[PDB]
Design a protein around this ligand. Structure first.
Ligand SMILES: O[C@@H]1[C@@H](O)[C@H](O)OC[C@H]1O
Length: 183
């Protein structure tokens, strides 16, 4: 079961996040800047099988619902995006991976002197982005090892030191509401 609760915001606008029982959380936001809220594990694993059910995911504008986490050595921010609002995230196309009933586009990107778990840093993003939005309100599995191993085939090797790993609601200059249960 989950062991970790993340409630990060850059403090712009209003983000109200609730650490509910077990693997459940909710977040309501109005005119946010950037925030990343969710539940999962304080140390990620490349072989974790993650399940969630988004009781609600209703961004008004830009928001993502993703498996989300970080490695160090080197510093990598990674995403498996199952749902989004007005904006589908993309980067430099690498290929596709088919997992858990969906097909995902694989992307890389460089973030130059940008916010990170270690402050301002230059780092890399690894993305799997579903080609269509996954159903909301259903029990959804992300078999993360499929993504890790697809990424590996494109030279997208994760770092050797694992930080947190969560099913994250992320907003950017938007408003919305989400309620998610993770296990
Ligand atoms: O963990 C946080 C990360 O999610 C955010 O993107 O930038 C600041 C970090 O503290």
């Amino acid at each position: 079961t989950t062991n970790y609760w993340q409630d990060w915001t850059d403090g712009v606008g209003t983000v109200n996040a609730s650490n509910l029982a077990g693997g459940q959380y909710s977040v309501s936001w109005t005119n946010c800047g950037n925030f990343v809220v969710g539940k999962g594990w304080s140390t990620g694993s490349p072989s974790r099988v993650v399940n969630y059910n988004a009781g609600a995911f209703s961004p008004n504008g830009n928001g993502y619902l993703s498996l989300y986490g970080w490695t160090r050595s080197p510093l990598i921010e990674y995403y498996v995006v199952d749902d989004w609002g007005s904006y589908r995230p993309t980067g430099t196309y690498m290929g596709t991976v088919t997992s858990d009933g969906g097909t995902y586009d694989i992307y890389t990107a460089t973030r130059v002197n940008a916010p990170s778990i270690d402050g301002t840093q230059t780092f890399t993003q690894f993305w799997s982005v579903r080609q269509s939005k996954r159903s909301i309100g259903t029990n959804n599995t992300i078999t993360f090892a499929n993504h890790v191993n697809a990424w590996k085939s494109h030279g997208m090797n994760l770092g050797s030191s694992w930080a947190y790993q969560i099913i994250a609601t992320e907003g950017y200059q938007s408003s919305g509401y989400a309620n998610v249960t993770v296990w």
